[PDB]
Chain length 149, copies 4
C-alpha cells in the first residue's frame, strides 16, 4: 500500500549517537584522507531501528551510484541524506545510508538533484567498498524531490 | 593573520533554534512550494553570534552563485552548509548563510564540490531575492575542500 | 510569428572557413593555454551571414552564463554549439556564437543539457572577455532540447 | 611506447560519410525520439579504418559510463567526441565511438570535462544497448584534457 514517509532521524534508534557534521573540520577530513579507504566511514556498524524491518517506506535523499544497467541507467545505489557523501566528504554513519536496488533505473545525468525513494524497507546489512549500510530497499519508485523556490 | 576555523554550529548563538533538516518532509516542501518566493526561507532573521564580527575566519561549504564577472567567474555568492540550498531544497536559516564577495573569482563549472572560504568575517545583514544572510565575508581565498575516499 | 529554425552551419557564409574541431589537438590546446586569454579565440571576427539580420530565429545549443539576476537565474549568456566551449576547450569562432539576453531567465543548475533559444535575431557584434560573437538574440523562449534515447 | 595522437576525423575512412551535426534539427530529434531505442543510432555499422588495429593511440573525448567498480569508479565506458552523446542527443556513428576498458577507474563526479584516453587501440566491434562502436581500447591512462582560458 501507501508508503510510510520517513525522516533520516527516524533511522537512528533512541540512545544511539546522532549523525555528525556533514562537513568535517579540516584536521578530521585530513586525518580520514591520510588514513586508508577502510577508515573513511567512522561508524560502519551504527545501531539500527529494528521496528522498520519489512515496512513500505518513502525517504528523501541523494543518489551515490553503484551499478549501471545495459540501458545506461543506475540500478544499484546508496541513498544518503546529503550530496557528495562518500565522494567529496566522508561517508555518513551506516544508519544514515540505505542500499537501494531498482528495476526502473535512474538516469546517470540527473543525479545532481535529490529524489524520493519508495519501496520495501529492510533492516539488513549491506556492504560496499565505498560504505557499509544498516538498511536496504527494493524500490518501487524513484522520483525527483520536487521543490520550487 | 591565520584564519580561525569555524563550524556552522558556531554561527548559531546559545539558546537560538538549531538548523532544521536540510531535506524537509514532503508536506512542508509542498507547503513552501505553494507559498510565494518570499516564504521559501522560514527563518530570514535568525539570531547571530555578534562576537564573530571583524575576525579572520575560515568556513567550509557549497557555493550558490549570485554574480558573474567579465572573466566568467563567480565573484558574489552565498556560502551554505549543504549542496542545493535555495535551489533544490528551501534556503537555510539566515544564520546558516554567509554572503561572500571575492576579487579572485571561482569557475562556474567546479561548483559541484565544497570549498574552504577564508577572509574577513562580518556580522552584517545581507539580502537577496534568493535568501537573507546574517553574515558577510570578503574572501582572501576560495579553495576546494580536499578529501580523498 | 513562428521562428525560422537555423543550423549552426547556416551562420557561416559561403566561402568562409568551416568551424574547426571542437576538441583541438594536444599541441594546439597547449599553445592556446600558454598564450594569453586574448589568444583563446582564434577567429574573433569571423565572416557573418548578413541576410539573417532582424529575423525571428530558433537555434539549438549549450549555455555559457554571463550574468545572474536578482532571482538567481541566467539572463545573459553565450549560445554555443557544444558543451564546454570557452571553459573546457577554446571558444568557437565568433560566427558560431550568439550573445543572448532573456527576460525569462534560466536556472543555473540545469545548464548541463542543450536548449532551444527562440527570439529576434540580429547580426551585430558583441564582445565579452570570454569570447567575441558576430550575432545577438533577444530571446522570447529558452526551452530544453528534448530527446529520448 | 609513446601513443600516436589521433583526431576523430582519422577514425573515418576515405570515402565514408562524415560525422553528422552533433545537434540534430528538431524534426530529426523528434523522429528518433518517437522511433524505438534501436533507431537512436542511425549509423551503427559505419566503415572503420583497419590500419588503426593494434596501435598505441591517444584520443580526446567525453566519457559515457557503462560499468562502475567496487571502488565506485567507472571502469567501462564509451569515448565520444562530444558531451551528451547518447543521453541528451542521439549517439554518434559507430566509427565516432570507442568502447574503453580501464583498470585505473575514473571518478563518476568529474565526467563533466573532456579527457585524454591512451592505450592499445583495436578495430573490433563492441555493442551496448546505448550504442554500437567499431573501435575498442584497453586504456593505460585516462587523464583530464587540460586547457586554461
Amino acid at each position: 500500500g501507501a508508503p510510510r514517509e520517513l525522516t533520516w532521524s527516524q533511522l537512528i534508534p533512541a540512545g544511539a549517537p546522532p549523525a555528525p557534521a556533514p562537513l568535517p573540520i579540516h584536521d578530521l577530513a585530513n586525518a580520514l584522507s591520510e588514513a586508508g579507504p577502510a577508515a573513511s566511514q567512522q561508524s560502519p556498524n551504527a545501531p539500527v531501528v529494528k521496528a522498520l524491518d519489512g515496512i513500505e517506506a518513502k525517504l528523501p535523499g541523494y543518489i551515490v551510484p553503484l551499478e549501471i544497467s545495459e540501458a545506461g541507467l543506475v540500478t544499484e545505489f546508496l541513498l544518503v541524506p546529503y550530496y557528495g557523501a562518500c565522494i567529496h566528504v566522508p561517508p555518513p554513519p551506516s544508519n544514515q545510508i540505505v542500499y537501494v536496488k531498482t528495476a526502473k533505473g535512474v538516469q546517470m545525468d540527473e543525479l545532481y538533484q535529490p529524489f524520493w525513494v519508495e519501496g520495501t524497507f529492510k533492516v539488513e546489512n549491506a556492504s560496499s567498498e565505498l560504505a557499509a549500510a544498516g538498511y536496504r530497499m527494493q524500490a518501487s519508485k524513484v522520483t525527483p524531490y520536487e521543490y520550487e523556490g
